[PDB]
């Protein structure tokens, strides 16, 4: 589920000056311009661009991506992966300048990724979505012939 | 086996028996991912009124996020099935389940469960002064 | 009397089994199962090599490039213990599987020794029905038999009788049974209807027709 | 004179959860067991294969007819009383007298016993159909199509197969029928009086029970740790002094479970050999007459009737 605007790490995507703030409110500032990037005053030098933020062990990972999309009000269903860009040793974000941004949440779950020859990420299916998905995740193959299989054990949490 | 089974209550001095609540192996039955993508789930050796109540209260540690079905529940002696419809007609067994129940993928198609079929039923008549002699053969 | 019909049935059977072997994909289940079991054992051994067994790292060269010769000894000991357990488990599973394959090989050896080089009167050991011969063929890590069988069909009702007597003497068939046919009685064999006239050549005498139940009064042709 | 011969076919299907047996409900114990990478899925796969092998054994033994036959309304075939072998319609249960007197003669650990694919009535239906086919169709219903023969002429043919001419049977049929009935009554009395005649099936059940009992009892040892209960370890130590005790419990319980799996594999191999022998015995002794000396019964062999048994088959040669 994602919130359309026409905890433990958040997901960002946006269809334009974009800024971020992080704190318990001295201030942690991230400002992205058209050409320059300004960030502990670290200074460095349609379409859909995706930033993945995560935080563990006193470190914060920032990942970036890019994909050319079609001009439409919602977001089309598609497949793309994003590479890491940087990592730093140290939730709502404001942007300004017809524009939209969407936020999804992160959960600790297991995936299973299919590579290829000359291969980036080509296909992936989740391991905690469907019983068929759990079966694919357990037999460790994309094609399962007819039969009965045992995957895991069920238990009721008190 | 050095297991805490019974406890006297430390305050009102009554008797409490301790049991482990329901758990077991789970299995998935599929017709193979070349005909469909719908499967059915077998929970082993539970009177799964408990399982239905606990999954409508969202307390099962196998976290099926989008899977929630309670319209097709069938009870066997090996456990209970969610995702199959009970059919009284007998057919030859396609995939084994247990206690004379076999699932299959016959009729639009869906997963159906039924009772084991013995085979081709017939009855040969007896008479005590008649014989049967074949007259042809096939190599 | 009907050699050409049997030859045509033989040729149709060979063509049918060739088509059935070449169309489907699941007929050699057992050899594929053997290969897949061996591959799964090797794969899970190689994958179990990649675990750290509670040590600080799972690569031995990384242990020997980051510790001295008294702090790396305990980690080396843990790797030795874990990999020893894994290798011993693989050896035990291999021994049991080899015992099963040896039993199957001895059964196949005695099957071909008692079914190809000779004809077996043990029912349902080679093929369904009666057995004529068998041809072996090679297979990847195995042998495939082609048993040829002779099965009867097109059954017919008849009226039977235990024995007949002509002048106070019971007559018993030599090899075959008595069939009424709706006409005068005949003698036949038990697997193919070919009636013949009752004669003293294929019938032998014992006792009188007073104690055996169900004797029929009928004539016995003597060839003079 | 008829004689009995009991064989095992299948043993008790079972399964063991690796995560429930070794660790309790602590997720850190699941992590420490995941350090011993990809180990306890092998045991579960082996026991699943064992259960499949048990179902294969029962199916390969009993289901050797492509069609079945209705139980005849009359149980008297020329002086041979068959009321003690074929099932009677009076009782609400569809089992014969011999089967009914022979069946009566013999959690916190994640242990489960899966039910068999075929129930008792399933096997009883197979046995009743097979016996009726022997009694009516003669020796040609598994070797091709069924061909109805009167019982006296089939007896004459089987005597001819032994080496005795037909007149010997047909001259003294009543004496042979009386001997048959006396033999059935004698074997019924011998089955119902004594308590030790089904040794092998009781031995199989007792061996499986002893293995399960000694596994459950071996769970209760501390393996050199400060206590034998994992919850007592996790309620009395921090996350660096309890790790070594958890490691010792993991190692000991892993050794015990691996030993139990190996013993189960060897025992299943022995039961598979017995099941194959029983399958070929019934395929070469009920559906036909065997000229192999001393394979079915003592002396010359005429026919044989199978009966069901708890995890087994009982022959009457
Ligand atoms: C303990 O406390 C309970 C709760 O107030 C009280 O009912 C009880 O009398 C007390 N004493 C004993 C011996 O249980
Ligand atoms: C399951 O429990 C309910 C209520 O306790 C009971 O009515 C039902 O018969 C039980 N199912 C079985 C198979 O015993
Ligand atoms: C057996 O059947 C075939 C096919 O119906 C027929 O051609 C043949 O003549 C039959 N055999 C005899 C002996 O009639
Ligand atoms: C033989 O006769 C009986 C009754 O007379 C009949 O039910 C049966 O079908 C007949 N057999 C064949 C092969 O026609
Ligand atoms: C058997 O009976 C038929 C009449 O149904 C008759 O035509 C035939 O000749 C008889 N068989 C022999 C060998 O005579
Ligand atoms: C066949 O059974 C009937 C039924 O009792 C009997 O009357 C008849 O005598 C029997 N046939 C022979 C040849 O004995
Ligand atoms: C066969 O034996 C049973 C044993 O109780 C008996 O009841 C029945 O009458 C016998 N059948 C006869 C004598 O035809």
Distance in Å, alpha carbon of D213 to nearest chain B alpha carbon: 10
Report residue B16 as tokens: 């409490």
Please tell me the distance from the alpha carbon of residue C170 to that of residue C147, in angstroms, as a whole number: 43
Ligand 5 geometric centre to CA of C201 (Å): 22
Work out whether strand B112-115 and strand B120-121 pair parallel, antiparallel, or are unpaired: unpaired
Ligand 3 geometric centre to CA of C7 (Å): 13
Please tell me the distance from the alpha carbon of residue C176 to that of residue C162, in angstroms, as a whole number: 11
Please tell me the distance from the alpha carbon of residue A54 to that of residue A60, in angstroms, as a whole number: 6
Q: What is the DSSP string of C85-127?
A: HHHHHHHHHHHHHHHHHHHHHHHHHHHHHHHTSS---STTSSS
Pick C155's closest partner by Cβ from D147, D280, D290: D147
Report residue A89 as tokens: 């040793």
Q: Which atom of ligand 7 is nearest to the CA of D81?
A: 1
Report yes or no: D287 and D64 within 8 Å, Cβ to Cβ: yes
Query: What CA–CA distances, in Å, run from B63 to A154, D73, D131?
Result: 9, 57, 52
What's the DSSP call for residue C151?
E
Report yes or no: A105 and A7 within 8 Å, Cβ to Cβ: yes
Name the closest residue on chain B to residue A158, using Cα atoms: B59
Q: What is the DSSP string of B79-97?
A: EEEES-EE--S-B--SEEE
For chain A, list the strands marked E by DSSP: 3-5, 10-14, 17-22, 28-32, 37-38, 43-44, 47-56, 59-64, 67-68, 83-88, 95-96, 101-105, 113-114, 123-124, 147-155
Distance in Å, alpha carbon of C162 to nearest chain D alpha carbon: 7
Please tell me the distance from the alpha carbon of residue D159 to that of residue A126, in angstroms, as a whole number: 70
**How many other CB atoms are found less than 10 A from the CB of residue C145?**
16
Neighbours of chain A (3+ CB pairs under 8 A): B, D
Instruction: Name the one residue in this structure whose structure tokens are 């995507």.
Output: A13
**CB neighbours of A58 closer than 8 A, spacing ≥ 6?**
A89, A90
Ligand 7 geometric centre to CA of D76 (Å): 9
- Beta-bridge mates of residue C145: C136
Distance in Å, alpha carbon of C13 to nearest chain B alpha carbon: 8
- C149:B130 CB<8 A: no
Using a CB–CB cutoff of 8 Å, tell me whether B131 touches chain C: yes
Report yes or no: D248 and D103 within 8 Å, Cβ to Cβ: no
Resolution in A: 4.1
Q: In what order do the strands lie in the sheet with B73-75?
A: A147-155, B23-30, B40-44, B79-82, B73-75
Report residue D198 as tokens: 């089904």
Please tell me the distance from the alpha carbon of residue D257 to that of residue D266, in angstroms, as a whole number: 15
Q: Which of C30, C37, C50, C54 to mutate to test the interface with D (most CBs of D within 10 A)?
A: C54
Cα-atom radius of gyration of chain D, to the nearest Å?
26
- Beta-bridge mates of residue A38: A31, A43
Report yes or no: D296 and D189 within 8 Å, Cβ to Cβ: no
Please tell me the distance from the alpha carbon of residue D172 to that of residue D301, in angstroms, as a whole number: 19
Please tell me the distance from the alpha carbon of residue D136 to that of residue D78, in angstroms, as a whole number: 12
Work out whether strand A17-22 and strand A95-96 pair parallel, antiparallel, or are unpaired: antiparallel
Instruction: Name the one residue in this structure whose structure tokens are 């995702």.
Output: B83
Please tell me the distance from the alpha carbon of residue D315 to that of residue D301, in angstroms, as a whole number: 13
What's the DSSP call for residue A74?
S
Number of H helices, E strands in chain B: 1, 12
C153 lines ligand 4 (CB under 6 A): no
Q: Using CB atoms within 10 A of its CB, is residue C142 exposed (0-12), middle (13-18) or buried (19+)?
A: middle
- D170:C52 CB<8 A: no
Rounded (10°) angle between helices D242-285 and C72-115: 0
Ligand 6 geometric centre to CA of D187 (Å): 29
**How many other CB atoms are found less than 10 A from the CB of residue A20?**
19
Listed by the residue before each break, gaps in chain D with C–N over 2.5 Å are 106
Q: What is the DSSP string of C15-52?
A: HHHHHHHHH-S-S-HHHHHHHHHHHHHHHHHHHHTT--
Q: How far is CA A37 from the centre of its chain?
A: 21
Please tell me the distance from the alpha carbon of residue C218 to that of residue C164, in angstroms, as a whole number: 6
Using a CB–CB cutoff of 8 Å, tell me whether D206 touches chain C: no
Backbone dihedral angles phi then psi of residue C165, each to the nearest 5 degrees: -135, 145
* Nearest ligand to the C-alpha atom of residue B9: 1
Using a CB–CB cutoff of 8 Å, tell me whether B111 touches chain A: no
Name the closest residue on chain C to residue D290, using Cα atoms: C122
Distance linking the first and last C-alpha atoms of chain D = 9
Ligand 4 geometric centre to CA of C171 (Å): 28
Helix (H) or strand (E) holding D53: helix D40-62
Name the closest residue on chain B to residue D16, using Cα atoms: B25
- B134:C9 CB<8 A: no
Q: Which residues in B lie closer than 8 A to residue C214 (C-beta atoms)?
A: 129
Query: What CA–CA distances, in Å, run from A46 to A4, A71, A100?
Result: 18, 6, 12
What 3-state class would DSSP assign to D138? coil
Please tell me the distance from the alpha carbon of residue D314 to that of residue D100, in angstroms, as a whole number: 13
Please tell me the distance from the alpha carbon of residue C21 to that of residue C180, in angstroms, as a whole number: 46
- C155:B139 CB<8 A: no
Among C156, C159, C183, the mutation site with the greatest number of ligand 5 atoms within 8 A of its Cβ is C183
Please tell me the distance from the alpha carbon of residue C126 to that of residue C134, in angstroms, as a whole number: 8
**How many other CB atoms are found less than 10 A from the CB of residue A68?**
7
Secondary structure string (H, E, C) spanning D243-308: HHHHHHHHHHHHHHHHHHHHHHHHHHHHHHHHHHHHHHHHHHHCCCCCCCCCCCCCCCCCCCEEEE
Please tell me the distance from the alpha carbon of residue B69 to that of residue B56, in angstroms, as a whole number: 10
């Amino acid at each position: 589920n994602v919130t359309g605007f026409h905890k433990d790490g958040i997901y960002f995507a946006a269809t334009v000056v974009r800024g971020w703030v992080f704190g318990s409110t001295q201030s942690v500032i991230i400002i992205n311009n058209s050409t320059n990037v300004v960030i502990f005053e670290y200074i460095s030098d349609k379409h859909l661009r995706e930033f993945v933020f995560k935080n563990k062990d006193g470190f914060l990972y920032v990942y970036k991506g890019y994909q050319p999309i079609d001009v439409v009000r919602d977001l089309p269903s598609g497949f793309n992966t994003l590479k890491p860009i940087f990592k730093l040793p140290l939730f709502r974000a404001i942007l300004t300048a017809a524009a939209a941004y969407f936020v999804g949440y992160l959960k600790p779950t297991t995936f299973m990724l299919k590579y290829d020859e000359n291969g980036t990420i080509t296909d992936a299916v989740d391991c905690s979505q469907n019983p068929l998905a759990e079966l694919k995740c357990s037999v460790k193959s994309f094609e399962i012939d007819k039969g009965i299989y045992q995957t895991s054990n069920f238990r009721v949490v008190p | 086996s050095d297991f805490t089974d019974s406890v006297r209550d430390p305050k009102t001095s009554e008797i409490l028996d301790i049991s482990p609540c329901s758990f077991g192996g789970v299995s998935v039955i599929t017709p193979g991912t070349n005909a469909s993508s719908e499967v059915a789930v077998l929970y082993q050796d539970v009177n799964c009124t408990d399982v239905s109540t606990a999954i409508h209260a969202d307390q099962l540690t196998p976290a099926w996020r989008i899977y929630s079905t309670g319209n097709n529940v069938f009870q066997t002696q090996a456990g209970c099935l969610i995702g199959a419809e009970h059919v009284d007609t007998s057919y030859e067994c396609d995939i084994p389940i247990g206690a004379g129940i076999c699932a299959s993928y016959h009729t639009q198609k869906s997963i159906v469960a039924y009772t084991m079929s013995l085979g081709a039923d017939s009855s040969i008549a007896y008479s005590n002064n008649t014989i049967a002699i074949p007259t042809n053969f096939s190599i | 009397e009907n050699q050409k019909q049997i030859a045509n049935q033989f040729n149709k059977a060979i063509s049918q089994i060739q088509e059935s072997l070449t169309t489907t994909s699941t007929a050699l289940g057992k050899l594929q199962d053997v290969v897949n079991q061996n591959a799964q054992a090797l794969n899970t051994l190689v994958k179990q090599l990649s675990s750290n067994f509670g040590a600080i790292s799972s690569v031995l060269n990384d242990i020997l490039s980051r510790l001295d010769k008294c702090e790396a000894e305990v980690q080396i000991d843990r790797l030795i213990t874990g990999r020893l357990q894994s290798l011993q488990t693989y050896v035990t599973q291999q021994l049991i599987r080899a015992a099963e394959i040896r039993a199957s090989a001895n059964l196949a050896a005695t099957k071909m020794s008692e079914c190809v080089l000779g004809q077996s009167k043990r029912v349902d050991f080679c093929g369904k029905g009666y057995h004529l011969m068998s041809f072996p063929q090679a297979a990847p890590h195995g042998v495939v038999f082609l048993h040829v069988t002779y099965v009867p069909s097109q059954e017919r009702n008849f009226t039977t009788a235990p024995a007949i007597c002509h002048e106070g003497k019971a007559y018993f068939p030599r090899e075959g049974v008595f069939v009424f046919n709706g006409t005068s009685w005949f003698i036949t064999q038990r697997n193919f209807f070919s009636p013949q006239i009752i004669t003293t050549d294929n019938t032998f005498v014992s006792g009188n027709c007073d104690v055996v139940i169900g004797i029929i009064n009928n004539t016995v042709y003597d060839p003079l | 004179s008829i004689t009995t011969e009991v064989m095992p076919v299948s043993m008790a299907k079972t399964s063991v959860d690796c995560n429930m047996y070794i660790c309790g409900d602590s997720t850190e114990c699941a992590n420490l067991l995941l350090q011993y990478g990809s180990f306890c899925t092998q045991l579960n796969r082996a026991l699943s294969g064992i259960a499949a092998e048990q179902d294969r054994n029962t199916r390969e033994v009993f289901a050797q007819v492509k069609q079945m036959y209705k139980t005849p309304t009359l149980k008297y075939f020329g002086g041979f009383n068959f009321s003690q072998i074929l099932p009677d319609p009076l009782k609400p249960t569809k089992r014969s007298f011999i089967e009914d007197l022979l069946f009566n003669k013999v959690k916190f650990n994640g242990l489960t016993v899966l039910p068999p694919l075929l129930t008792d009535d399933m096997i009883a239906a197979y046995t009743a159909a097979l016996v009726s086919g022997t009694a009516t169709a003669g020796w040609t219903f598994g070797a091709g199509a069924a061909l109805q023969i009167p019982f006296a002429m089939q007896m004459a043919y089987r005597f001819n197969g032994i080496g005795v001419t037909q007149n010997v049977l047909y001259e003294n049929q009543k004496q042979i029928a009386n001997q048959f009935n006396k033999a059935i009554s004698q074997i019924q009395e011998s089955l119902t009086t004594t308590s030790t005649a089904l040794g092998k099936l009781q031995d199989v059940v007792n061996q499986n029970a002893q293995a399960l009992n000694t596994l459950v009892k071996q769970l209760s040892s501390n393996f050199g740790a400060i206590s034998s209960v994992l919850n007592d370890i996790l309620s009395r130590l921090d996350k660096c002094e309890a790790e070594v005790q958890i490691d010792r419990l993991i190692t000991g319980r892993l050794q015990s479970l691996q030993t139990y799996v190996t013993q189960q594999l060897i025992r299943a191999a022995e039961i598979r050999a017995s099941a194959n022998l029983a399958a070929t015995k019934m395929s070469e002794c009920v559906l036909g007459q065997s000229k192999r000396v001393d394979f079915c019964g003592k002396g010359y062999h005429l026919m044989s009737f199978p009966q069901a048994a708890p995890h087994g088959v009982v022959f009457l040669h």
